[PDB]
Amino acid sequence: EPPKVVVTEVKEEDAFYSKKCKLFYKKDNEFKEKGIGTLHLKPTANQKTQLLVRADTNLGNILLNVLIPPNMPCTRTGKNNVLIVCVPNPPIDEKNATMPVTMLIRVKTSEDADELHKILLEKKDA
Amino acid sequence: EPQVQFKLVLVGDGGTGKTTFVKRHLTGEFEKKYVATLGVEVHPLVFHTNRGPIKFNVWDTAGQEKFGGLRDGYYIQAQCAIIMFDVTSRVTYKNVPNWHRDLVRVCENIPIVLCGNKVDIKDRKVKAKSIVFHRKKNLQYYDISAKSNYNFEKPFLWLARKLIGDPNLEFVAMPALAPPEVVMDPALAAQYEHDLEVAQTTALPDEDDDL
Ligand SMILES: Nc1nc2c(ncn2[C@@H]2O[C@H](COP(=O)(O)OP(=O)(O)NP(=O)(O)O)[C@@H](O)[C@H]2O)c(=O)[nH]1
Ligand SMILES: [Mg+2]
């Protein structure tokens, strides 16, 4: 039988919200997988909030790291998904970093997907 | 940009998943479709350790004979290497000694890791008891799966310990420092939020219950 994959999660004690998720980004006309990870919402020195996604590995690869802008596109779609548009950091295309990218945040349940959509909209306002 | 960097050459039969393993470390992507590599693709991998940063300049070579060309250039000045095969394809393991010869011919005594990929697949053909190629002090073996990320960081961690001379070197996570805020045009943002709400041209991915 395939071996179990054990991961010592990278913890973010300073986050006020943390949910396991799967991330995708729209290129051509497909949503390409970015990996399974954990979405973190952390404080800043300002009233702005940090949107952080670390991969489900021992190294906690930073898949996304962005301040939530006030007019961030944010919409609820699907069974358990939340769409957003932002200038990705780390960049997805090094040549055209400045171009916003449409992104899909999947979570396990529709209820906790509805929750992610709520608190994100709450933090756009600040 | 780390000052400490090493040239790492990655070889093995075509289809064994060499590129998919690099993308997992590079971007977290996993592409189901098989698109063969043409020539070589060089990607930098940065790892944070307890002793400071390390950069591996990974030379991801093509495994197919018709796509690899003459491989001597890819190997010269290589300071480490990874050989890969597919545990669901016994032939890819039969050819491991051939890849080992080519590497020792051009690079001599470099630390090398043997990686048996696709251990996430149930019907395994090359089992661990059968794998007995590794016997030397500069060779190591690991089971990995670039799909399930089994033994994700082991090949690089072992190479970094040999290259640095510290058996106790450990990889650590990179801190996520607050990024720069990016201001968007309000009208443009309104148009994006509208396109999201109505424009659903791209189909939502299939719902694997991975989470
Ligand atoms: N199940 C499974 N499939 C995998 C895994 N790694 C790669 N694959 C699949 O195997 C195929 C070959 O992957 P690829 O990374 O292109 O292999 P490669 O050895 O770089 N090919 P080439 O030498 O021609 O470039 C793809 O369909 C890929 O999705 C794995 O860990 N598990
Ligand atoms: Mg390849």
Swiss-Prot record, chain A:
Domain of life of the organism encoding this protein: Eukaryota
Cross-link (Glycyl lysine isopeptide (Lys-Gly) (interchain with G-Cter in SUMO2)): 11
Tissue: Ubiquitous. Highest levels in testis, peripheral blood leukocytes and fetal liver.
Signal peptide (from-to): none
Annotated localization: Nucleus, Nuclear pore complex; Nucleus membrane
N6-acetyllysine: residues bearing it: 108
Residue span, RanBD1 domain: 1-126
Subunit structure: Interacts with Importin alpha-2, Importin beta, Importin beta-2, NUP153, Ran binding protein 7, CDKN1B and itself. Does not interact with TPR.
Function (record text): Component of the nuclear pore complex that has a direct role in nuclear protein import. Actively displaces NLSs from importin-alpha, and facilitates disassembly of the importin-alpha:beta-cargo complex and importin recycling. Interacts with regulatory proteins of cell cycle progression including CDKN1B. This interaction is required for correct intracellular transport and degradation of CDKN1B.
Domain comment in the entry: Contains FG repeats. FG repeats are interaction sites for karyopherins (importins, exportins) and form probably an affinity gradient, guiding the transport proteins unidirectionally with their cargo through the NPC. FG repeat regions are highly flexible and lack ordered secondary structure. The overall conservation of FG repeats regarding exact sequence, spacing, and repeat unit length is limited.
Identification of the protein by name: Nuclear pore complex protein Nup50
Protein source organism: Homo sapiens (Human)
Recorded name of the encoding gene: NUP50
Complete-protein stretch covered: 343 to 468 of 468
Curated annotation (Swiss-Prot), chain B:
Reactions performed catalytically: GTP + H2O = GDP + phosphate + H(+)
Subcellular location: Nucleus; Nucleus envelope; Cytoplasm, Cytosol; Cytoplasm
Modification sites for N6-acetyllysine: 32, 55, 66, 94, 129, 154
Linked residues for Glycyl lysine isopeptide (Lys-Gly) (interchain with G-Cter in ubiquitin): 66
Gene3D superfamilies the UniProt entry points to: P-loop containing nucleotide triphosphate hydrolases
One term of GO molecular function: magnesium ion binding
Effect of substituting residue 65 to A: Strongly decreases the relase of bound GDP
Effect of residue 32 to Q: Mimics acetylation; enhances the nuclear export of RELA/p65
E.C. code: 3.6.5.-
Name of one Pfam family that matches: Ras
Name assigned to this protein: GTP-binding nuclear protein Ran
Organism whose genome encodes this protein: Homo sapiens
